[PDB]
């Protein structure tokens, strides 16, 4: 059981990015959630249940779809979104939960 993410993306300041996530087994329930971690800080929950927003999080952030295959698209990009982004899924009776490698987001001038 493993998950994978993209590598080192860069993107422009009204810009849009899509971060792709794969899992080798299909998740249990719809248990896939998203986090951002800024350096020197603990993780912050963004999306849970594949597509539901967490508390205080804007609707620039959207998550999709089901599997196996998931995507997180951030639109209307701002500077404070440069961070690392993580994927995290639930399964079934040992190896219950798993994290991916993490995709760092470099925000760039337009």
């Amino acid at each position, epitope marked *: 059981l493993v998950m994978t993410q993209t590598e080192s993306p860069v993107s422009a300041a009204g810009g849009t990015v899509t971060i792709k996530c794969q899992s080798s087994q299909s998740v249990y329930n719809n*248990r896939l959630a998203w*986090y951002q971690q800024k350096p020197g800080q603990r*993780p912050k929950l963004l999306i849970y249940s594949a597509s539901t927003l*967490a508390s205080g999080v804007p609707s620039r952030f959207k998550g999709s779809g089901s599997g196996t295959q998931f995507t997180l698209t951030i639109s209307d990009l701002e500077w404070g979104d440069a961070a690392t982004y993580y994927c995290h899924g639930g399964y079934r009776n040992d*190896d219950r939960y798993a994290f991916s490698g993490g995709t760092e987001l470099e925000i760039l001038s337009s």
Partner: nanobody
Amino acid sequence: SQSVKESEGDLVKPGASLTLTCKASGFDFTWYTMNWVRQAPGKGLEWIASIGAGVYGSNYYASWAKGRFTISKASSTTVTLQMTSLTVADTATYFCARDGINGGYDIWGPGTLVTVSS
């Protein structure tokens, strides 16, 4: 509003044992599953172990962690991670995180540093 705080991180020699402790504020583990997640320097988040809601909550482990780690609910407000046979690769910031809703780690501690070295 609600929070958890890890404790008891240390510098320690290879082959030694160590116990971490996470203490809740403003809530109970009666309704939530609690997790230990670590972060080695230069590397991503890694799930270690979970323990289920309530007194008779069930435990799960990552494959790699089964022999040398043990997760425990000391009480309704305190979690425990027993780390037995440490190696240098076990050097990391260790996190306590609450499964608030259907897999979303709603809340995190700051973390404690465990360093394994000569």
